[PDB]
Design a protein around this ligand. Structure first.
Ligand SMILES: [Cl-]
Ligand SMILES: [Cl-]
Ligand SMILES: [Cl-]
Ligand SMILES: [Cl-]
Ligand SMILES: [Mg+2]
Ligand SMILES: [Mg+2]
Ligand SMILES: [Mg+2]
Ligand SMILES: [Mg+2]
Lengths: 265, 267
């Protein structure tokens, strides 16, 4: 505990960074943390709960995975690599939007889903319905990434998001079908190979969602399953303005690698 | 014909490249071509017909999109971004493998599917069944990318692949359901934003499969639909050993830009 904390502190000082981390068990209990209850910007980590909300509306018969979400170039965003590919067709399905939002972090895809669930206020409501008293969305993409110090819009804490993610992935509020879909989608994430996953062994099942924002923000939340079958969530939130991008990912990987050491013990 | 062909020759000479190209209409008829009947290595363009073969088996009730294809690290390849993510779980579904092979060009995923259809011989048989007398697969990933001059293993022609792709996308061999799935997967391809698509307007629906190989090989085949609702396929095969990677993609985009200029006139 003492050791894990001093290790993260050393990483802060070496990198002139701020790091928040929570490692939780299947049931949401804190195993190890550092600044676990400090507020950070979600950045794109919000897309994981967003996808769960959409899945919960499918579960409730309020949404259909093949429903066409019609849009045109007016709905594009600067970072929207899938939506730009599909725009000439005039739509993406709910399914395609979920996959794009999760595995590519597509901002237009995420905005399409936000539109269909009732916008950031309804994602906040969703967080509260899960027992997450902290996490909140307020803005749509891309303005939710400003990461201004002291601004509580669009924020979580490492503990809260770790506990929310553990509930979604290992808990039972989603149907078994949706829970399975979410897990396989996260495992297939394309943006997290240099982040938490780079600090975990390849033999562990891992799924994650990254975030990147202004003021040097770089985040990742992952679930993983060890070879002994034990289940965890690791949230890692960082602000590292003095680091270059590859160095920001290495910092998260470094955190994961320290977590790996604790899990093994 | 003349203007188009001279534009491509110009590109060859400017880039010390070899380029083959076929632009075909919906029904496979050649609109414009340059070296359209010369052989080139398919490289990863083969993964488009591979996916169609798998969908044809689904259509026939011989395959199931949710079937788990079990594998372990012994199945991984050097370029296998998706399969490496899923390997701890022990499998990928047929659907996951199709999506990964198409949109990422994942080599392990393609090899998983090849195993389930009977391997390169049966993909070649599928080509034949479609009326493509030329295209052939002989090796699995990654050795199929050697692109050695005069080696006919793992080769097609720009016209053969254009016609095969137009049959698969716009013809009757796949069910409506499977045709739509294939199309939407190709439209979401993640590796073609700087190749054919970069030369076509944003308003045209485009879906594509790229290929990259040794000896400067860089390929792309795409279907597109203009705003008038006319349907085409464009296949572009290039060997450009003297260019850097980004320049190889720009060469393909430049070909597609010439095809665009032509299609607009035709319309
Ligand atoms: Cl983009
Ligand atoms: Cl499919
Ligand atoms: Cl590639
Ligand atoms: Cl490729
Ligand atoms: Mg399928
Ligand atoms: Mg590649
Ligand atoms: Mg490739
Ligand atoms: Mg290229």
């Amino acid at each position: 505990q003492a050791d894990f904390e001093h290790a993260i502190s050393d990483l802060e000082a070496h990198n002139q960074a701020k790091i928040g981390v929570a490692l939780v068990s299947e049931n949401g209990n804190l195993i190890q943390g550092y600044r676990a209850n400090e507020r950070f910007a979600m950045c794109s980590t919000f897309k994981l709960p967003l996808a769960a909300l959409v899945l919960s509306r499918i579960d409730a018969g309020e949404e259909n995975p093949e429903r066409k979400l019609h849009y045109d170039s007016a709905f594009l965003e600067e970072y929207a690599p899938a939506a730009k590919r599909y725009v000439a067709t005039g739509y993406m399905t709910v399914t395609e939007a979920i996959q794009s939002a999760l595995q590519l972090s597509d901002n237009a895809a995420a905005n399409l889903l936000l539109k269909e669930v009732g916008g950031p206020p309804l994602l906040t409501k969703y967080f509260r319905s899960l027992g997450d008293k902290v996490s909140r969305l307020d803005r749509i993409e891309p303005t939710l990434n400003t990461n201004t110090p002291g601004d509580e819009r669009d924020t979580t804490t490492p503990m809260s998001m770790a506990q929310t993610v553990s509930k979604l992935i290992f808990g039972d509020t989603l149907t078994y079908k949706s829970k399975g879909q979410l897990r396989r989608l996260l495992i297939g994430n394309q943006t997290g190979d240099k982040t938490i996953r780079a600090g975990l062994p390849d033999s562990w099942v891992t799924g994650d969602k990254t975030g990147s924002c202004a003021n040097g923000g770089r985040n990742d939340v992952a679930f993983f399953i060890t070879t002994a079958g034990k289940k965890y969530v690791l949230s890692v939130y960082t602000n590292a303005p003095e680091l270059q991008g590859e160095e920001r990912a290495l910092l998260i990987a470094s955190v994961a690698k320290l977590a790996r050491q604790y899990v093994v013990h």
